[PDB]
Amino acid sequence: KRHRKVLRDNIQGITKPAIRRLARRGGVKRISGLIYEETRGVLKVFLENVIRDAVTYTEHAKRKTVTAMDVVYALKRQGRTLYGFGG
Amino acid sequence: RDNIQGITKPAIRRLARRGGVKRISGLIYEETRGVLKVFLENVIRDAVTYTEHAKRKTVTAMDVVYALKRQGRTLYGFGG
Amino acid sequence: GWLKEIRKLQKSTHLLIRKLPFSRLAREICVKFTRGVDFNWQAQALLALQEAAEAFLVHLFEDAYLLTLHAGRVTLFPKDVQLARRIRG
Amino acid sequence: QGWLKEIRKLQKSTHLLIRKLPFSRLAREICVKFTRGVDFNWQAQALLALQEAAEAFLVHLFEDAYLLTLHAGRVTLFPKDVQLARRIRGL
Amino acid sequence: VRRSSRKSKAELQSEERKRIDELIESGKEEGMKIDLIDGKGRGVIATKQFSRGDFVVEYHGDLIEITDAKKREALYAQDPSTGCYMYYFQYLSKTYCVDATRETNRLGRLINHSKCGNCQTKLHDIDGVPHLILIASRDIAAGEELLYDYGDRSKASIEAHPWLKH
Amino acid sequence: AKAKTRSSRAGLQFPVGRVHRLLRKGNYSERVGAGAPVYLAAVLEYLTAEILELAGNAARDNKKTRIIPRHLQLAIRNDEELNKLLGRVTIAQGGVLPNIQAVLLPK
Amino acid sequence: ARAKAKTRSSRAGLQFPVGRVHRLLRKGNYSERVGAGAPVYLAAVLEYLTAEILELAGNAARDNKKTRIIPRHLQLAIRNDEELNKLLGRVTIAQGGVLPNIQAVLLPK
Amino acid sequence: RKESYSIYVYKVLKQVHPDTGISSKAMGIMNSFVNDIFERIAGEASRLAHYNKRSTITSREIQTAVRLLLPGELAKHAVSEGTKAVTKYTSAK
Amino acid sequence: RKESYSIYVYKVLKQVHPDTGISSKAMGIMNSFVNDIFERIAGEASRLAHYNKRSTITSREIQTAVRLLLPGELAKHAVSEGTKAVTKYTSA
DNA sequence: ATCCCGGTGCCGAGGCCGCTCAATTGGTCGTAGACAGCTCTAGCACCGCTTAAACGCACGTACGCGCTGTCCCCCGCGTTTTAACCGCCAAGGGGATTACTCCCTAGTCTCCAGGCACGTGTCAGATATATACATC
DNA sequence: GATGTATATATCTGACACGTGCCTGGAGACTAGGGAGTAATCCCCTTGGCGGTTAAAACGCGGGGGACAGCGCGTACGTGCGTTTAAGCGGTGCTAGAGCTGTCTACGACCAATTGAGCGGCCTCGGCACCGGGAT
16 A cells, blocks of 8 residues: 655644734734744744753753753843743 | 933934934924933933942943943943 | 634633644754754753743734734734844844 | 935944034933932043943934834834834833 | 954855755765665665765655646556655645656665654755755764655555554 | 841841852852841842732732732733833743733724 | 963964953952863954954955944944844944945835 | 742742732742842842952942842832841841 | 053954054954953853852853854854864963 | 633642751951042033034925725634644663762962053045046 | 036045053962862653544635725925024133042951751642533
8 A cells, every 4th residue: 555755844833723822812813824934933043042052051061951941041041031940 | 401402303313314214204303302311311320320339420431331231232432 | 703812812821832843843953953962851941942932922923913003904914023023133 | 315315424424413512411411310419420431422322222213113114104204113113122 | 364264154055055956966876775674675775974964865756736746646556566656745835746656866766664764854945846855864874774754644554554653 | 145047137038148148159249248138138028029919919809819920920011110120031821911902902 | 480481372372361361250250260271262262253353344444445443344344244243233332333224115216 | 958939938928918829830930030130139239349349249239239220119119128127137236 | 550452452453454453442342342252251151150060160161151152153163263272272 | 602609629739847957156367448638630611713503484295194996815614634642651861969089270479571551653544626427 | 517426636634553661460380179070879750652532733615804006185394595503612720529549447258066947748628720500
């Protein structure tokens, strides 16, 4: 039984109704249809920054588990101070 | 009194023109004087706090440079 | 129909993107800043990263929709999210 | 033209666009509102640092509030645009 | 005389893209030999120190639209001796299909399916047309077999091929 | 002889001792005054009393008796001073203030 | 003090002062101790960044056909560069002017 | 053994709202808030000390660090409370 | 005895553009830039040392602070420069 | 649809007890910084004069804004389908702790050289006029 | 054909690049100690896998809500010009106040002793969530 071949992207896992719910929480009454790829791009950029700094804070501590304090300090460095994770 | 009116209309217009603005609603002048007064109130409150703490009476250049660095607007050219 | 959802979501506080797809996304981005070696993301750090990403995206959409109510629209186009960022920093 | 020569001329110079003495009097009037009725001397380069900062701020504010009024279809800067460019930045 | 060589990100991405394009249009296929594997059929062993993102192969084939894509797989599947050579991908609200059943001097169609393999497929669009690239997502040594994921979860297919889940 | 904590000498609830130790081992200065920990602890207790008062108010408005992250986000974003202070700060599990632009409501 | 001394900057091949950077790292209360390679690393980084900026500043000054780097040329170099502009984003450069940019929707037809 | 301001935030809570609890998540948020405000005030006081070529963080430096970091009415009231506590601490011996 | 970086920026200039001068205001601006980047890198190294319960600021801490503060290519090249300088310094 | 009301329930919070570590006390010293005093810088004030810039007015026309139409594209709905997720389990890596030792840095003192203020020659660039050309 | 702008020459002027005395800090050598690097251990807690479930995503479709282009009115902004005005510059003055310094005194670091507060494990119970019903 021949099967076809496809792939996934792990960014399309940030699904379309998830961006709809994020928008709606932000107050967005009516969302365009091209805001989804733009939002996945914005999210990937933000994550790239915060995760570069979390992974740096880890690699410096000679660890291999990106603790919650690594991410909290990465956000505190970017200026996104996050309360509630052992700061 | 009315020293904010000393920030003339053509001065705000030249600031805008530098910023790229092509036309300017005649109501942007009072808005810009309000915005400028708020910015100065913040920066001068921090400058005068840095002074009053240093037990001085002349707001130095470093007082204002540290006020700006505190608001997050680091200013290069006057020491640091 | 949209308003029974905006009121329903601005009143709740739970997370919006699912946990597992976001975990796979964060681990796919963490595997290119370590040059292909993977780090055991502590399961309480995926939550912190996700809470930060949701609060960021929600604030970004608040500002974007301040911009799409400015242009007279009600729709939130991509030329908005792209300008609520080019203004913000 | 006319506004276009003024723009090309001002975006290319590096002057201080607000007169020095009116801004001096304004900063000295705000320096009194705090520390009620005690005149702090002002180091003549503190007024320059303060004016450099206020002018870089206002020029960036108009440069950011003109992206909101080319975006809104206008060409004319409005007070709405400045208020929104400030309400987005976080001010 | 002391001059910085910093290679601005625009130039970095441009030179990376030109590198992928020239390595694709040259088809060196440096160090991959086809041999026999104990049960799965054939196998293409890689013999280079592969690492994160380094180029491996191109899944060369014939590119088509979706209306015929959803049909050609079933139409060629009527021959029970065709293996698996056609690849789907959704791109710009449009699906395509890499018709690669006919043997060509490329080594993309010569790979089998796994979920514990060593490579994963990406997309590269050399002047619009998307060529389906394959790069090593992890560190691979010289002497390992090419093995990537077909990503299709047809229920009848997973019933028929228990080695798809492997 | 019999001792009483510095938090009690100052009439605070926060620890003057732990604050002094944190000022010392934090490498903020080569020295630390005697009034510095007391002052900092008094300021911290005041800020926390403010935050917890506003959070208790926002909890009684919802007819609840526990303060939860959402209540802290309400107490913060609604007060002007604190929102200006905790401006860069995201409060996990804090939601957003219900604020739908009046342009959007059906006419 | 025999074996005539060569500055640590000279020993490392830098132009910035390893000695002064060490002294600033010490009397600045950044940490109780300070490594021996910390001043050398930090001074090498500072020299690299200053070379990166003075290179682009001189490029701009010779594009304007001048031979003195001025605040305007530093603002040009920094803001036109893609990464220095991100490192120095919050930073106002006194008498630096702004980048010439009239939005393309403004020009006459 | 990890330190935190849980018991003290709880005492202040029992001061302002006696009949009210605080969930463990809001407890962690108040711990992080107290830690962050402490780091802000103490860092600004360290900076105010080093700017004046002095070495001691005194109540002077903390009062000015508060007057810098906190907005208008928070600043005035926090400075009032700190001064009250310092005079109460040096009065009683 | 006023501290500055003027003569060292002069040296680096005469090393990059050997036939180019620098005005006094641009000298002050480069001075402020060096002071500011030094303050940033040192504060970040201090934060790292405090996070990992260490006591010494070392080349490890300074390298991590450089990698955190400078954007991509600047960070790569600055780390290269600093590593080269440290190896040369410990060799000599 | 959604809030007000009952009753279950459950799980997390609030209180209780034993240990331990760190907060308090007291005494000593050394050094930081408070203070008084002195010098001399530069900030404030004023005033005359120039004149650059602001200003007030008028006019036209560029543009903002409200209205209309049409075309297309979000949204809501219903059905299939899919993959997040929760529990359970198993493993095993690596985080966290601790003990040892060694080497790396602070402290000290002596030496000395480089860099900083200061005086000075000179030249890069900002005008000023003339020449030539771009442009609406 | 003004009206402005690109290009050269003359120049001169304040700012810059450079030589010098010296003095303050940078370098060397040595010692000691304690910070951290290394090794080993324990067990937490992260990863991986499976089954099943079901909540949620995906897809397609209709329709009607909204985006966008066009248009006409009218108003309010830009430009131009003669007038008024206030900034600016140069002087002097002067004097408050910043910067520096020497004394010394109070105040904070340090160190031994101790003891009690707080942190962790145990245990109970009720606040808030959930499932179902009546009212708005």
